[PDB]
C-alpha cells in the first residue's frame, strides 16, 4: 500500500491555444476522475520561431487508477502534441493566524 507522488504534465505544442485546449481537457477529465489539479502554469516561449508549453499539475494516483488514466491520455492526444509526465520536486492572514495556534 503506497500512494503515488504528484506528477507534473508539461504540454508542449506549437500553438498556445491548442496547448491550452488540451490543458483544459486533461483538467476536466482530471476533475471528472476526481484528480486534483493544483496549478496550470505556463512556460516561456521556446525561442530558436517559438512554441508554447502549458503545465497541468496532477496530484494523487493509484496503481489501477494510473494505468487507466495514462492510456486515456494517449487516446486523448490529438497527435502532433507532445505529452510529458514528471514527478514533482505566500500565505494569507487566516493561514498564518491558524499557524500560530499550532506552534504556540
Amino acid at each position: 500500500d503506497y500512494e503515488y507522488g504528484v506528477l507534473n504534465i508539461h504540454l508542449t505544442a506549437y500553438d498556445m491555444s491548442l496547448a491550452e485546449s488540451y490543458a483544459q481537457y486533461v483538467h476536466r477529465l482530471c476533475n471528472r476522475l476526481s484528480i486534483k489539479v493544483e496549478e496550470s502554469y505556463a512556460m516561456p516561449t521556446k525561442t530558436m520561431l517559438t512554441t508554447h508549453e502549458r503545465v497541468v499539475q496532477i496530484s494523487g494516483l493509484s496503481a489501477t487508477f494510473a494505468e487507466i488514466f495514462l492510456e486515456v491520455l494517449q487516446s486523448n492526444l490529438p497527435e502532433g502534441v507532445r505529452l510529458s509526465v514528471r514527478e514533482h520536486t505566500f500565505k494569507a492572514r487566516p493561514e498564518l493566524e491558524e499557524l500560530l495556534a499550532k506552534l504556540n
Binding site: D1, Y2, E3, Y4, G5, L7, R32, S62, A63, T64, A66, E67, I68, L70, V72, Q74, L77, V81, R82, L83, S84, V85, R86, E87
Partner: protein, 70 residues
C-alpha cells in the same frame, strides 16, 4: 453581418454538434468505467487462485514514472 437564416443554419448545426458531443462523452465515460471494473475483476480472479502473489503485486511501482510518449 450574418443574416437570420445564416444564424439559423449555424445554430441548427450547433445543436447537432452539441448532441453529438454529449453522445460521445456518455459512451467514453461508460467505456472507461467498464475497463476499470474489468481490471478490478481481473484483480479478484487471481486472488482466488493465489492471493499471496497480489501482496507483492498490489504495491505500486515507484520507478514506473516518469513516462513520456506522445
Amino acid at each position: 453581418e450574418h443574416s437570420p437564416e445564416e444564424s439559423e443554419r449555424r445554430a441548427l448545426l450547433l445543436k447537432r454538434w452539441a448532441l453529438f458531443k454529449q453522445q460521445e462523452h456518455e459512451m467514453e465515460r461508460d467505456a472507461i468505467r467498464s475497463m476499470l471494473e474489468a481490471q478490478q475483476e481481473a484483480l479478484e480472479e487471481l486472488k482466488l487462485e493465489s492471493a499471496e502473489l497480489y501482496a507483492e503485486a498490489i504495491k505500486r511501482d515507484t520507478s514506473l514514472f516518469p513516462f513520456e510518449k506522445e
